[PDB]
Amino acid sequence: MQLFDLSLEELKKYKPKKTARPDFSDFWKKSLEELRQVEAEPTLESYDYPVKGVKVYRLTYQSFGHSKIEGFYAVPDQTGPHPALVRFHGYNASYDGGIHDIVNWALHGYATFGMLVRGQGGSEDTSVTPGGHALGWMTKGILSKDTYYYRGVYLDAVRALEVIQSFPEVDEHRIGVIGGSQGGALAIAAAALSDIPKVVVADYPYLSNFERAVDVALEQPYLEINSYFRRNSDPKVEEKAFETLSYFDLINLAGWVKQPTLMAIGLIDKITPPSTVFAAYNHLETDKDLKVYRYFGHEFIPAFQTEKLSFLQKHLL
Amino acid sequence: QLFDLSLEELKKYKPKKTARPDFSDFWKKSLEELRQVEAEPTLESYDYPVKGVKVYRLTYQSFGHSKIEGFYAVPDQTGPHPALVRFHGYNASYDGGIHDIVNWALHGYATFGMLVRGQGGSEDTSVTPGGHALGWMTKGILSKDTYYYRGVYLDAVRALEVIQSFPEVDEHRIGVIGGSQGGALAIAAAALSDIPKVVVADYPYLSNFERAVDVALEQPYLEINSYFRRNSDPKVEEKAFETLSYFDLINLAGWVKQPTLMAIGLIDKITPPSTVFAAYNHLETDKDLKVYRYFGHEFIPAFQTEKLSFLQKHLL
Amino acid sequence: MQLFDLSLEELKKYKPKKTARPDFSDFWKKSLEELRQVEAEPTLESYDYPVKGVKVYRLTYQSFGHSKIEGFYAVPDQTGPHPALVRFHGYNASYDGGIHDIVNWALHGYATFGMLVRGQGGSEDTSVTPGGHALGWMTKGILSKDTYYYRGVYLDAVRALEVIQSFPEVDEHRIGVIGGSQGGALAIAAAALSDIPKVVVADYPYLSNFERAVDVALEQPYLEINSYFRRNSDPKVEEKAFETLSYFDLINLAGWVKQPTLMAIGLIDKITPPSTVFAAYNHLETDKDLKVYRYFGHEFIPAFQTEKLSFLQKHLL
Amino acid sequence: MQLFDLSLEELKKYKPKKTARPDFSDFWKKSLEELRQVEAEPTLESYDYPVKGVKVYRLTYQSFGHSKIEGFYAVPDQTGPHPALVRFHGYNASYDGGIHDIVNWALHGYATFGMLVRGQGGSEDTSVTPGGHALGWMTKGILSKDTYYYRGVYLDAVRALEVIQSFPEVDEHRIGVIGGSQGGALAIAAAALSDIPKVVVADYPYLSNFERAVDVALEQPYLEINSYFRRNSDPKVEEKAFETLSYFDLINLAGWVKQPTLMAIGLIDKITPPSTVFAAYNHLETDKDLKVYRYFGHEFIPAFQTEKLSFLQKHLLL
Amino acid sequence: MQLFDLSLEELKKYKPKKTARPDFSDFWKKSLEELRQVEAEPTLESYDYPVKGVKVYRLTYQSFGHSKIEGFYAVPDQTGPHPALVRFHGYNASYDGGIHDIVNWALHGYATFGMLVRGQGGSEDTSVTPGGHALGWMTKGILSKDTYYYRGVYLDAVRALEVIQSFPEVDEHRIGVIGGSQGGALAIAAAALSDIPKVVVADYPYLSNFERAVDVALEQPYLEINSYFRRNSDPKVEEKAFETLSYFDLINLAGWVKQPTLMAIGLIDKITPPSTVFAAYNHLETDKDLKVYRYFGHEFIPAFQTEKLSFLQKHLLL
Amino acid sequence: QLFDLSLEELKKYKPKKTARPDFSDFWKKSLEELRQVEAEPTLESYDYPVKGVKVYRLTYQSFGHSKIEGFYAVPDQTGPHPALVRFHGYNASYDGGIHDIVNWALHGYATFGMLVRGQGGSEDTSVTPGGHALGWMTKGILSKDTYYYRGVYLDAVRALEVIQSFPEVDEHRIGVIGGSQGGALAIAAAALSDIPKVVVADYPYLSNFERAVDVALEQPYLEINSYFRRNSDPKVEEKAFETLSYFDLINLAGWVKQPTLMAIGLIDKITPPSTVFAAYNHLETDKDLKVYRYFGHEFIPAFQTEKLSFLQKHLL
Numbered sequence A, C: 001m002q003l004f005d006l007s008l009e010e011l012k013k014y015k016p017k018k019t020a021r022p023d024f025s026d027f028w029k030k031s032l033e034e035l036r037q038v039e040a041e042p043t044l045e046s047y048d049y050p051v052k053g054v055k056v057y058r059l060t061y062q063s064f065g066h067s068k069i070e071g072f073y074a075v076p077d078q079t080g081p082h083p084a085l086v087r088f089h090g091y092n093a094s095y096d097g098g099i100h101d102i103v104n105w106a107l108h109g110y111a112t113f114g115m116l117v118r119g120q121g122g123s124e125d126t127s128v129t130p131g132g133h134a135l136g137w138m139t140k141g142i143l144s145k146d147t148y149y150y151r152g153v154y155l156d157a158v159r160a161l162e163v164i165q166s167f168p169e170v171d172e173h174r175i176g177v178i179g180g181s182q183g184g185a186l187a188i189a190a191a192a193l194s195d196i197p198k199v200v201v202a203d204y205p206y207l208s209n210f211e212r213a214v215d216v217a218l219e220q221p222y223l224e225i226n227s228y229f230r231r232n233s234d235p236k237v238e239e240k241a242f243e244t245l246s247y248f249d250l251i252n253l254a255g256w257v258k259q260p261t262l263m264a265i266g267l268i269d270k271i272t273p274p275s276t277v278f279a280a281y282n283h284l285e286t287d288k289d290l291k292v293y294r295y296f297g298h299e300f301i302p303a304f305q306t307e308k309l310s311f312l313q314k315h316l317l
Numbered sequence B, F: 001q002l003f004d005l006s007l008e009e010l011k012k013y014k015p016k017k018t019a020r021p022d023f024s025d026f027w028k029k030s031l032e033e034l035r036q037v038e039a040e041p042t043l044e045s046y047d048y049p050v051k052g053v054k055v056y057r058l059t060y061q062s063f064g065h066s067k068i069e070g071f072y073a074v075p076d077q078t079g080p081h082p083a084l085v086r087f088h089g090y091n092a093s094y095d096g097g098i099h100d101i102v103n104w105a106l107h108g109y110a111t112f113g114m115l116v117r118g119q120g121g122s123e124d125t126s127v128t129p130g131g132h133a134l135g136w137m138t139k140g141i142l143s144k145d146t147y148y149y150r151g152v153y154l155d156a157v158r159a160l161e162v163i164q165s166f167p168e169v170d171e172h173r174i175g176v177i178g179g180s181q182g183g184a185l186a187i188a189a190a191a192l193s194d195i196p197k198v199v200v201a202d203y204p205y206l207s208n209f210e211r212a213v214d215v216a217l218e219q220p221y222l223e224i225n226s227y228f229r230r231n232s233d234p235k236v237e238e239k240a241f242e243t244l245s246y247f248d249l250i251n252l253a254g255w256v257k258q259p260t261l262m263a264i265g266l267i268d269k270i271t272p273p274s275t276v277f278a279a280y281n282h283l284e285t286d287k288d289l290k291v292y293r294y295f296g297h298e299f300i301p302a303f304q305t306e307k308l309s310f311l312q313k314h315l316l
Numbered sequence D, E: 001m002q003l004f005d006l007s008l009e010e011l012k013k014y015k016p017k018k019t020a021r022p023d024f025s026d027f028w029k030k031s032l033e034e035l036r037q038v039e040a041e042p043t044l045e046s047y048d049y050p051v052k053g054v055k056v057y058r059l060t061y062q063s064f065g066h067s068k069i070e071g072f073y074a075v076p077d078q079t080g081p082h083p084a085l086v087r088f089h090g091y092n093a094s095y096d097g098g099i100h101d102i103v104n105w106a107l108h109g110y111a112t113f114g115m116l117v118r119g120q121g122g123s124e125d126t127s128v129t130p131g132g133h134a135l136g137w138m139t140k141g142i143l144s145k146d147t148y149y150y151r152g153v154y155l156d157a158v159r160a161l162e163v164i165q166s167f168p169e170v171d172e173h174r175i176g177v178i179g180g181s182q183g184g185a186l187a188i189a190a191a192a193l194s195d196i197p198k199v200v201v202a203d204y205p206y207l208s209n210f211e212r213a214v215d216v217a218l219e220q221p222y223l224e225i226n227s228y229f230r231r232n233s234d235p236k237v238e239e240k241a242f243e244t245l246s247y248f249d250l251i252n253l254a255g256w257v258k259q260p261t262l263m264a265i266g267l268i269d270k271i272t273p274p275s276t277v278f279a280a281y282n283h284l285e286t287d288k289d290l291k292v293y294r295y296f297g298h299e300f301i302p303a304f305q306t307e308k309l310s311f312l313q314k315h316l317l318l
């Protein structure tokens, strides 16, 4: 592929005005309160996996809307407490719960839980579908911040941290949140809504600068929003949709992140355009660093893996 | 270009039903749960730049207490009028297909375009049991009780019950029509309800799943393939296909007693000819399948005439 | 896909200098005169169609070059006079004469005639092919305004209006011309050459700002011109071709339109680039309005249908 | 691209039943007669070209429907008579009259004329457009053999041979017709309608076995027919169309070819499917040979150029 | 994608006749002898990597043609001997030496060496380029088994095993060879030429049933061969090329494998078509098993990773 | 379609040279290593169905003792004849481009189509130091001494030395021509040898690398991008570009003193207009760049006339 978004020089300076409504923090305050009203009631069931030195489990817990969230949980097979990681998977990109990577994270020394995102890689989503929406999760319940798909997801992410930190074999002071694109977005959103995480690693975070994303993205899933408007021409629906999205946009959440953060971005990424990622990064006011990779897009970036491992090792291991 | 079975083979393609022993029992129970939900329909007039037709926004309660909607256009003249319940295609509803609904009314039919749950409109209260591929095709696929289309099919039946209750509607002249997903709902509705008089289905979807996933070259059948890629458990595949059989047209076709008109393009890559012939060949009723060599999953002009002529003859 | 032409802000101000030669109106004056010399001699043959309340016919008439033009003609089955519509189809986009849409227009209350464009959806084209040209109609007889394909077409469009208005069941004071792409172009061209039309509706009009179109378009049929030049490298051939096209370019004809006009444009339209459509719109000095649709391209735009029906209803019904 | 049509074993045996109507030869007899009624009145205008040893001209002549046909004509700059070639270009594939190739053919020793196909690479087409048709020339006037686009084209091809052979610097007994795709079809059609040509070279000939082509081709321009039917659903239109096409189908003309013929075909050709080309070849009853190239499609095949040059050299230059 | 090759029923029975020439084993006997003549002279240089419990090194050694082969070598940071793995990467698919995966393999308890294939993911290739060839490595030196690209590669693979087993911290009786596509092919080839490996894991092995692959494959890199023939039309070149390829074709090497073998194949794999993989599998006469995945292609198959980890654990780790 | 800098900008695009301080020293040493290899050319007649031309297989020894080949066609008449050394495009040589070589001879030019190492033919003895992206673009890219094109450029020069030594060849009327990669070799040959009288380069490749990798939308420039994806080490990228500068046309152009004719299509995605104008704008010699708005990386008929006319004027 090739360069397409703003020049690197412009990207570094790209910092769009926040779109957060006056009731932004109030919405998250209320949302967190509804989550708190749901007892976690976590369950742990051992799971066989052909690995030595790691114990794998299937973890489930109750979250927003009384939804049962799941994911594999791998723990180093040695005395703890262990530093932990809550890993979030990409949009519709979870295969068999990403169990093999979860196990490898545990082999690296981290008690790791790969929270499966509602209705995607796993987990239950009790939230009702208010009405029509484009193919996908991007616009489900988009006409209201209370019904929006990611409201439950973000909360599940926070609840995931609360459950993990409660584990006695987990060192609550050494918990990191990581993920790619959608996963990176959940990581950042979790760090913004909970102070449990110590550090944050986000690979080309998704759900960022929506109003620009729909005009710059050249591939799914941002375009699901575009597809949604094509099916609902009502001008008010568009205003409303973007109004809803602002409550979940990383450029509005970034400011709450106080944890050391490591981000990555490929300049030829057509799914999460550089501009939208730099936008999130430029709204972060915390110990941070953005690794830029000229020749990579929305994919695994080997050089960034080293960075990631090194960063987590330094702050947690 | 041509790709599925030859036309000669297609005419003879009739795969063994995959219906489980509790097939009709499942639908009997499902219809019963629907019956337990009062329709409580509502009608709100809706402005539209047309003369001779009155448009409304119709809503009603269905399975799972979901609120189903759709525009309802009625010829602006004394009834009773023959009616049509039109079903839209998969993720293919734009602005409720209001313009086509209105035109159907201009053709003389009191028409209701039922919006399919979470797609073109309507509420879907059914919970998402677990992970599934991007789309609706695999939502709740691990159980016939939780499967996406269970609610949809019931909404379709309820739509007919609501429409026929209207005094301006001639209950004896109600037809069900639709394209692909819409065609599948039409056929499924006729199989579960005797309210419809005739059925028109354009290259019906949700048919012969086990073959569709091996022949289709485009979405949305492949959503199932994507689902299995994400859940390699062999039991998950057995289960999924077990679930799908309760909604597969080749198992429902047999219950259709209404005159039925179908269409199929031989280069259709979304609803492969074989899967459509399969549904057609399982129908034991007054039927006819219009084959169009040079068309695919799209509007077929020649079939519109056929369609208008068929509906006119049985309803107008 | 995604945005690609000039920004919306720029589009609103895009008004390229007319390319009309000094003999512009003289060419059309002469052309109209040659048309006038051909007796219409229209014929009406009833045609069976499964519809109630509408009578369909096959209408044919003689036009420029003694070509026999055809098209279905649907009339509300009630006492007239009826408001009428001359509908023009898109480039190579006529299927079975667009009869189903013609009938629906009649059901909406309009005596409608879908003029089939020469050699495309129907009708005879007696104009000779002077020499080589690219695959398609875009460059047929392009080396001279007298031989150019659209000369006959535009005249057929005018003649269509003359024939329809002559019908006793047609209210000559309530005739509108409509069409999409090529059809929108014929609509606008007909209103510029004839004062018979009362109103004009054009969906992303084609044949506009050719010199820019060949540099911005990303799909057919504008690129047929590009293909033509690839096959005739002679620099003079290119000057000549554009010289010819200027006599049919909407930016040069728009100024003659005095009828209320309604236009539409999708910002991601790659066939008739937004710039070329805004160009035509910005050259119109009449009661006008351009509906912009951010998320649509060269296709049916539901929201615009309402606009269209509402516009025609207000001016004709 | 990859293999897709019938297996090579099947292709060699593929010989579809002729689709020629009972008035087939009568149609061509009448058609040739109408051509004969139009005086050629050829004209020759010298044309400058940066080459040594060759004289280039612009050649024009009157043909069917009084259409003015053109094309460059290159002649070796030495005393004749010279062996000649009438080269036909591919569908919508003529750039600047293919002048550079015409000149090279002359450098190879052949007085060469690249007849430009009506409305495509050049030449005038006076034939009227009866009615609607798909984008392209494939379906123009397809509802009647008298109005069909290629009627004039085929006749132009024959007239081209008559004009060329009349030239004193041309050895009428050493004239070959060559072409690729559409050009190969015109070559074969010209040899079938005129005995002027001595030999024939056709690269993956087009306009062959229409009824199958529309079901096997995966690219233009055969699919123009498919597009046409999509726009005219009337079943009678399809019967008529194929009726018309049969009068121009190579499988029905091949049998009249008596000249030595050399053909080529790439097995991954998606424009002129192998089956449709083998069909034309298998209907030829004359000194013939079909060069098969497994790894090539609808494109220039180097190995076949050698074959071609060698074949022409043997039958004409030699 | 979608199904396209032979049906599963046919695939299970697909076993093409070997194409090995009469001097097959003689060629490999001589080739191994030339390798033996090159002293390994391995070198080990520690390499920093952000991991705990594993020591990483850059390993290099001399192989066929005195080429210096490299790759990262990760070892569990605990007392050995350790079971080992020689991992081979896919065609042009090595990024930064696949170091992250090498380390993870070591975390699973395996002393792992990711041999970088000549000129691809790393390593030196001293073999000269005899002449023209298609873009890529597939046809380099294809006109002779002595000059063919993979001759050196296969030998590097065998040498890799010899070097690893010589390490004192490596349990020579618990060495496994694994790889995907090209990597799977090297794994199988190494087991066929060396008895050092105990078990073999090959994910949809490449370099198998060449003569069919070039007719079934729909993506690179098999088609490089097709591209090569397009550029060298000489019929003898094709005979020669396939003659050369037979000495490296898995269907001819499979028979020498005596080690327990685990293979995988996606039925919609367009790079290494199912038929070509079943062909290699059906030529294996040893403790074997082929995991078939209906919905996967040429990619990472999660279900097969479990199979793989479980298989290696059973035969090596525990 | 248009995509690079505007034509107005292209005419002014002249990027700073990237030549290292040892630029000419590298080429001086390189030419010296070539000189140390005796040409030892061989000529073997080759049958070809043509009249008036004699074809031969020509081979000679070059840098690294590599045996370079190519067909050589000579007008079958008394010489001396003007000559042409034709270079083929990247991976674009089929059967040695023999048919074109013959046609060039028919136009009156003793022509030799040098086959580029390992591509259209010829032997490449240069070792592969290490890993590199699929293709020749990055082979030995970590050092100017090992880089693929070092041998190629020298083979080009050696080709001229061999041809001019032929008695039937008029050493004062030798032109070098080629497209893209071939155009680049032509220009590089004219820069390193004064044997060529004139130069014709069709949209020359290997030009302004640092921009090419950011503007190109097709192969083979992107091979470099692929290389960096496989070797993330930042130093590897600095080194690679350091290597490439020794072969970049923007750094060699200045040495060209021969009349030069270039062509460029404005929609060329393989050799972007900017990279070609870059090479052109670095030429300080009798020159001319033919711009073709509607063409890309392909045969441009109009330019063929230009080309034939230019060569005729300077050589015939």
Ligand SMILES: O[C@@H]1[C@@H](O)[C@H](O)OC[C@H]1O
Residues within 6 Å of the ligand: A095, A096, A097, A099, B231, B232, B233, B234, E303, E306
């Ligand atoms: O369904 C998957 C199962 O088959 C695999 O064994 O372990 C991971 C699960 O997600």
Ligand SMILES: O[C@@H]1[C@@H](O)[C@H](O)OC[C@H]1O
Residues within 6 Å of the ligand: A303, A306, E095, E096, E097, E099, F231, F232, F233, F234
């Ligand atoms: O070049 C790579 C380096 O950047 C990475 O850090 O380690 C692996 C190497 O291959």
Ligand SMILES: O[C@@H]1[C@@H](O)[C@H](O)OC[C@H]1O
Residues within 6 Å of the ligand: D306, E232, E233, E234, E235, F094, F095, F096, F098
């Ligand atoms: O190998 C080729 C040969 O077969 C052909 O005849 O002439 C050109 C050569 O390159």
Ligand SMILES: [Cl-]
Residues within 6 Å of the ligand: A130, A131, A132, A140, A141, A142, A143, A144, A147
């Ligand atoms: Cl909603």
Ligand SMILES: [Cl-]
Residues within 6 Å of the ligand: A268, A269, A270, A271, A297, A298, A299
């Ligand atoms: Cl990407």
Ligand SMILES: [Cl-]
Residues within 6 Å of the ligand: B129, B130, B131, B139, B140, B141, B142, B143, B146
């Ligand atoms: Cl489920």
Ligand SMILES: [Cl-]
Residues within 6 Å of the ligand: C130, C131, C132, C140, C141, C142, C143, C144, C147
């Ligand atoms: Cl013209």
Ligand SMILES: [Cl-]
Residues within 6 Å of the ligand: D130, D131, D132, D140, D141, D142, D143, D144, D147
């Ligand atoms: Cl016709």
Ligand SMILES: [Cl-]
Residues within 6 Å of the ligand: E129, E130, E131, E132, E140, E141, E142, E143, E144, E147
């Ligand atoms: Cl070789």
Ligand SMILES: [Cl-]
Residues within 6 Å of the ligand: E001, E268, E269, E270, E271, E297, E298, E299
């Ligand atoms: Cl694949």
Ligand SMILES: [Cl-]
Residues within 6 Å of the ligand: F129, F130, F131, F139, F140, F141, F142, F143, F146
């Ligand atoms: Cl290197």
Ligand SMILES: [Cl-]
Residues within 6 Å of the ligand: F267, F268, F269, F270, F296, F297, F298
């Ligand atoms: Cl290009």
